[PDB]
Amino acid sequence: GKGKPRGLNSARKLRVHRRNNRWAENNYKKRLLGTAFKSSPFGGSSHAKGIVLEKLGIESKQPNSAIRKCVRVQLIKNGKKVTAFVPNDGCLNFVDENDEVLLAGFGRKGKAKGDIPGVRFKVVKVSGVSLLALWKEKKEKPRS
Amino acid sequence: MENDKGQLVELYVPRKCSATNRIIKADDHASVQINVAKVDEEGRAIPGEYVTYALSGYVRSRGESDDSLNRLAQNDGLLKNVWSYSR
Amino acid sequence: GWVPVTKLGRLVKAGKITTIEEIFLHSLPVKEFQIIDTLLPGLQDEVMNIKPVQKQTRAGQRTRFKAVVVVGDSNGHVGLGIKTAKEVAGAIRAGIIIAKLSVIPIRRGYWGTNLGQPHSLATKTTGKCGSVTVRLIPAPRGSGIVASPAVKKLLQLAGVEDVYTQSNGKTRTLENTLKAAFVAIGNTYGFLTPNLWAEQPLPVSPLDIYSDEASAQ
Amino acid sequence: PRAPRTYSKTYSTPKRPYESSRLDAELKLAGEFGLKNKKEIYRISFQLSKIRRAARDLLTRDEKDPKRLFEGNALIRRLVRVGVLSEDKKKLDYVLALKVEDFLERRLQTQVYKLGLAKSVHHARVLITQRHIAVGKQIVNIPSFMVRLDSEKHIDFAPTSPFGGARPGRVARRNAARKAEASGE
RNA sequence: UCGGGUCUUGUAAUUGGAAUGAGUACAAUGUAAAUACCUUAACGAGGAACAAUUGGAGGGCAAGUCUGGUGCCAGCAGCCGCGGUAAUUCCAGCUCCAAUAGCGUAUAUUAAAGUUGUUGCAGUUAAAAAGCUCGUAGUUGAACUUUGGGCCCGGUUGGCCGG
RNA sequence: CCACUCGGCACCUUACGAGAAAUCAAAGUCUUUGGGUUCUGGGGGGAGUAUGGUCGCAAGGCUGAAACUUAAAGGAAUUGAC
């Protein structure tokens, strides 16, 4: 009878079977082990601030050849070194080194076929300033 | 099926089978309708008066329509000493 | 002027059959779409899909077109037809024709009470094609059609006003889905209910009442 | 630390955002009735949804039950008071065939135009929001007033408004003052 | 045939007379005192600026068969991705679309998910029947032990009435 | 040898029915979803690897991860072009 017990005094076997088989999910296992509270670089938050250590010319080769513009940051809350993408600025003229940056998440899945990376994070603010309004020229950036 | 006014609201009443009493649907082409001619005292067939039977595609396809039509005929007095109810 | 070739067709041309309910009543095989066109004058088609398919025919890479077409009355007479042809418009037209041939009726019924016209279906039904299973459940009045827009359009070409749907399987491949929904709406005249337990006498065909007419000379 | 004051939402976001037949039907409703937002349609959809849920969960109970007859008569009478449901249709079955246009026709928005007090539906909304229209004695300037049936023989112009009463407005007497000064000049 | 009126469009930064609050404010109301609201004298728009934005226009998914630059920072970037004088897909302009005082993004959750399945998954070959058997806890466990008949009582709907 | 009856290992048709298909008298009686009960799986790698426990003289066995990485990896069937 469908390989599972159907007796009317068998609720215990059913719920122990569910608690054993829910560890095969992905979100459950990340969620009840405290994965984000231990090893994820944001520590389970939606944003983070950090200090720019480097500007990086990452390369995406195949099948799209592009020069990815990234930034190696050291986060303030953790002491954690994270590279992150910065959009829409070909010059990175709003970014210098040793500036403070508000980062968010970024869902690009890079490919394995040509060693192209998808870094996990985008730049939202530099030096307190909205990077969008910089690139759309609605504010000016204080340069320290 | 009718409405609250008591008038019928269907497109058509389906023909039911006779061997298994199930519905002969609008596309059962393996089913069959049988006419058997009413005879005269001289043994002449009456032209426009038949006894009808309905033998559905499941019945006919399974390989049963002969025996079932024998049963229906002897129970309607068209055969005798053919279909035995005990086997 | 259309000349028939079938004795059903020259019955239909003679004005000796009025509705398709005789043909639906007698389980007849139709082979002339002109019968359907003369008996459903308010039959309104709609294309569901036209798609170029690349053939490899005797060293020739060519482009044909698969046309999935649904015809359907605003009352309960539905038809499905799928046709591959060399041209777009020829595939359209012959898919219309194949949908004219495979017209089946539906039994749309009530949910709950008995007022006015039947709006929903009469029971639950289920169709399957490929791995696509489509389950139809009756719905209260004015609840619309809870269905994906292909299936929803095939149901709007039936005069089905209210139905809940659930599917299962890979419903990406839309021709399996339309075939499964078409089987589900064909099986509604296939489930025996207690209000049709009443024994009915078997009526005669038009083939024998009108046997002296409509014979090949 | 007080009573946490209650509130609710009133519209409902549709499930799929881009659906050509729905966009066309909503825009036909807006054109026939002079709306401004899709949210003004979604409000009526949400209210009709709650009414249909109340109806179809009272239908499952058998008749001659006091809860069904009580709440059904309350609902039906309340719909008849605003003229959304008609006189003959006073059953629970006919409130489910009741559609959105039946609600949307019963607005002050609509009833100003339909009584021949405005030239346009847009002109009707304008005469509403510029405080020209009274129901009995109280002036209403929300187009979503949803006129109850008994309130139909009271919609007129206000005694405040220049169309219905007291002195002509700002532009009128301004132009009259310029005419009188220029005739004096 | 002309032209006789009924509509309904489109424009013409063409013209006309209207309506009114945003805002300012005598006063009055308000309030412990005020501020604000509801009222209200007196001002207050052709509104070429009392200027509506946010994201898009390959497909999913509504919207370009448009122009220029790019094509050494560029076939590009939730997913799939498609020419390089000639791009519906980069940048800009025009045009169009969606919701609109609100729209987008990140994180989490829920739905979609019948991908946690009691309802309601799957286990020949797609992931997965322990190498086989014994066996404790656990789960599950054949049929049978007053039927049938008769009496009276009074209810709560429906008809045949309406008294 | 003939006829019947149990209890087997296998065969060969069909399809009523199932399945994505090859096929299946069970892999049927399953959306019209419930006879009882045991075990197992939740995209692919990383990896049956690391660590701990236990069994063994040893070889090893049982139990058994995460970080990280990625848009496919697959199963069946179908055609003809080097």
Question: What does this entry look like structurally?
Answer:
This is part of a larger assembly, with chains A (144 residues), B (87 residues), C (217 residues) and D (185 residues). In chain B, 20% of the residues lie in helices and 26% in strands. With 87 residues, chain B is an alpha+beta fold. By secondary structure, chain C is an alpha+beta fold. In chain C, 27% of the residues lie in helices and 29% in strands. Chain C contains seven helices and ten strands. In chain C, the strands form three sheets. In chain C, strands 1-2-3-4 form a four-stranded antiparallel sheet, with helices on both faces. Chain C has a four-stranded mixed sheet with strand order 7-8-10-9. Chain C has a two-stranded antiparallel ribbon with strand order 5-6. The longest helix of chain C is centred in the middle third of the chain and has 14 residues, at 88-101. Chain C is flat, with a radius of gyration of 19 Å. With 185 residues, chain D is mostly helical. Helix content of chain D is 46%, strand content 4%. The radius of gyration of chain D is 22 Å and the shape is elongated. Classes of the chains: A alpha+beta (144), B alpha+beta (87), C alpha+beta (217), D mainly alpha (185). Chains in contact: B-C, C-D. At the B-C interface, β1, β2 and β4 of B face α2 of C. The structure holds two RNA strands. Chain A: GO terms for molecular function: structural constituent of ribosome. Chain A: Its main location: cytoplasm. Chain A: There is a cross-link at residue 55 (Glycyl lysine isopeptide (Lys-Gly) (interchain with G-Cter in ubiquitin)).
